[PDB]
């Protein structure tokens, strides 16, 4: 019975453990502060749900582990500069950008990028923290700390956002789910909607890009590529070297979930193409307490994280899938009065995807 | 918040625990020999995946425990003599029978029940162990121990077997799954097939019968009723006061699984009718080692129990569901060479359901 250890103690690891169980794979999520002595890392394949970390007794032990899959890929992706350079190397479309070295460069930056600059911390950002959207007369708001520690990109006016989640096997095979439509508000993902068949052109463009990246990196497991939809085609925004929030719908809307797919990849099990026959919606639960009334609606799949509820925190997600989009829209409509007000916008945006 | 302890350490408990996690319900399977001092009985709803048990430090604590849902139904069900009588008291069709008290009753038993008698141990039987099929000149095979400890009933020539899995809530509401077709060989269930819409007359007869049963008992949770199909309609074979093997398909083929439904009922959560839109097939894994090649087929959902593989032991099950029956048939066909010989019969029988 394969053993896998996942570095990091969040919901991602928990979902990987839940997926592993019925497949006969024991998965052990280990936080950074864990005691290595307690960790069966020796008899396990190591994976992670994080991409960067401080040095601890646990991480020092891991360091010397032969089977930490993708170990060397993380730092490249963990630093936005190196990630952006990777797209450049591979000729992949992405927002024009540059390292933002010091105050003095501002003039050349706007000259280069346009009216709106999007400044991003090279490492550690998530949910939009560590991101600034500045105009020529607003540069003084950027913390000095940021000089040398941030990249700056052109503000992209996309018509929508989509991510491609897929996986690469140790033998180079790759498999993908259809593109997923993502809605972000205030920097955090709120809702995702996936259809069995995406714009065929967009789907091929994305697969070619993701494929080139996984190959170049020699990556094994699941990776998510977030892109921006523009009239010239997609632009890659960023990558996540792991299972990703946008693909949670796969737990209930694909024959093989992103969690199962990642475990198959890393343990070298078969990686056939997951079957996706119907559309799916996923609503993220953020800073809200669980309301079991949601369970009155039979299509709603509750995925609760057993995390402390605090503002802005991802606490769970709700998935719904059905071959009849009317049912989905109706389920959505019934959910509105059962969710806090800030959820209406995303729920309605999901409904409109079927309109 | 949800804390449930389940009496019994088998795969059913494990599947209840996997189901409860994402719902935010912490499920603790407790074996009979467990140390009561290590169990959260005081802060939980108690359920069980077994129906009769010896007195141990652990079960002693469960006697009369107010949090143990259905505690008094178990014993009624656990004895076939009491179970049969229930049917009788509710005018529900069942096989003509009687308590088999002693050797001398034999000639009259055959005069009354006809050619073939089915002897069954009053308690503890499963997978056909404790059952004997006898003609009038074979009674000497029945161990002497049986007299007074087994019932005897009419061998029924049924055209097929179907089970009804459903639940009853604390307020009397009930919900059910469509009937499932079950195939038993050598006393053990090998395969099940469910269709979204079952014979209407049949489904209604089953629901009326099971509702009468659960209501009569004040039962809360999931119960399964195995029946035999005959030209006068269904005959009830036996009941399982819990989630049941023939309902495993609901893990992937219904919007709410029988595991989830049981936890909903017992925790007083909502109990809407689960959605079932496509057919499902479940192949029981018995005494065989896991074969990861099964995973090359994308529709296959592996549910491995993490049990030691021994002859005749249920080690797992494979579920498959899709709206396209031709897909299911093709997946079944591909499964044959990937399973031991003894599985062909069952797989073919499933395929035949779609023929
Ligand atoms: N150049 C850009 N132009 C316009 N919008 C942008 C741009 N970069 C980011 N955004 C918007 O901000 C959202 C969050 O940005 P991004 O993914 O870089 O940050 P993050 O902190 O890494 O978020 P996370 O890791 O949680 O996805 C994007 O999905 C998009 O809505
Ligand atoms: N009276 C009967 N007539 C004909 N066949 C019968 C009869 N009783 C049982 N059988 C056959 O034997 C099977 C198993 O019998 P039964 O369910 O009573 O046994 P069990 O040991 O309680 O099995 P389990 O608890 O594992 O379902 C039935 O599903 C059916 O195939
Ligand atoms: Mg990011
Ligand atoms: Mg992002
Ligand atoms: Mg039985
Ligand atoms: Mg039975």
Swiss-Prot record, chains A, B:
Biological-process GO terms, alphabetical: 'de novo' IMP biosynthetic process
Domain ATP-grasp: 84-267
E.C. designation(s): 6.3.4.18
Binding site for ATP: 80, 120, 125-131, 153-156, 161, 184, 237-238
Pathway: Purine metabolism; IMP biosynthesis via de novo pathway; 5-amino-1-(5-phospho-D-ribosyl)imidazole-4-carboxylate from 5-amino-1-(5-phospho-D-ribosyl)imidazole (N5-CAIR route): step 1/2
Keyword Nucleotide-binding: yes
UniProt key word Ribosomal protein: no
GO cellular component, one term: cytosol
InterPro entries named in the record: ATP-grasp (IPR011761), ATP-grasp_carboxylate-amine (IPR003135), ATP_grasp_subdomain_1 (IPR013815), PreATP-grasp_dom_sf (IPR016185), PurK (IPR005875), PurK_C (IPR040686), PurT/PurK_preATP-grasp (IPR054350), Rudment_hybrid_motif (IPR011054)
A Pfam family that the UniProt record links to this protein: RS_preATP-grasp-like
Highest taxon listed in the record's lineage: Bacteria
Top-level EC class as recorded in UniProt: ligase
Single Gene Ontology MF annotation: metal ion binding
Family, similarity comment: Belongs to the PurK/PurT family.
Subunit comment: Homodimer.
Protein role: Catalyzes the ATP-dependent conversion of 5-aminoimidazole ribonucleotide (AIR) and HCO(3)(-) to N5-carboxyaminoimidazole ribonucleotide (N5-CAIR).
Protein name, UniProt field: N5-carboxyaminoimidazole ribonucleotide synthase
């Amino acid at each position: 019975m394969k053993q896998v250890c996942v570095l990091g103690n969040g919901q991602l690891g928990r979902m990987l453990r839940q997926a592993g169980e019925p497949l006969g794979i024991a998965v052990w999520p280990v936080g950074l502060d864990a005691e290595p002595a307690a960790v069966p890392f020796q008899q396990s394949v190591i994976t992670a749900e994080i991409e960067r970390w401080p040095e601890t007794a646990l991480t020092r032990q891991l360091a010397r582990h032969p089977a930490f899959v993708n170990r060397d890929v993380f730092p490249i992706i963990a630093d936005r500069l190196t990630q952006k350079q990777l797209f450049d190397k591979l000729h992949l479309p992405t927002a024009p950008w540059q390292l933002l070295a010091e105050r003095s460069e501002w003039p050349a930056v706007f000259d280069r990028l346009g009216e709106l600059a999007i400044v991003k911390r090279r490492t550690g950002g998530y949910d939009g923290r560590g991101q600034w959207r500045l105009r020529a007369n607003e540069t003084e708001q950027l913390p000095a700390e940021c000089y040398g520690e941030c990249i700056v990109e052109q503000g992209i006016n996309f018509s929508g956002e989509v991510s491609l989640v897929g996986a690469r096997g140790f033998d180079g095979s790759t498999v993908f789910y259809p593109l997923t439509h993502n809605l972000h508000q205030d920097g955090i993902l709120r809702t995702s909607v996936a259809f069995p068949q995406a714009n065929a052109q967009q789907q091929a463009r994305a697969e070619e890009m993701l494929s080139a990246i996984m190959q170049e990196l020699g990556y094994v497991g699941v990776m998510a590529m977030e892109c921006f939809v523009t009239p010239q085609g997609l632009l890659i925004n960023e990558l996540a070297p792991r299972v990703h929030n946008s693909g949670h719908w796969t737990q209930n809307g694909a024959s093989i979930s992103q969690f199962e797919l990642h475990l198959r990849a890393i343990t070298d099990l078969p990686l056939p193409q997951p079957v996706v026959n119907n559309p799916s919606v996923m609503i993220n639960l953020i800073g809200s307490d669980v309301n079991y009334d949601w369970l009155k609606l039979p299509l709603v799949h509750l995925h609760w994280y057993d995390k402390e509820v605090r503002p802005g925190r991802k606490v769970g997600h709700l998935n719904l899938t059905d071959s009849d989009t009317s049912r989905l829209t109706a389920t959505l409509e019934a959910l509105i009065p059962l969710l806090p007000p800030e959820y209406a916008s995303g729920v309605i945006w999901a409904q409109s995807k079927f309109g």
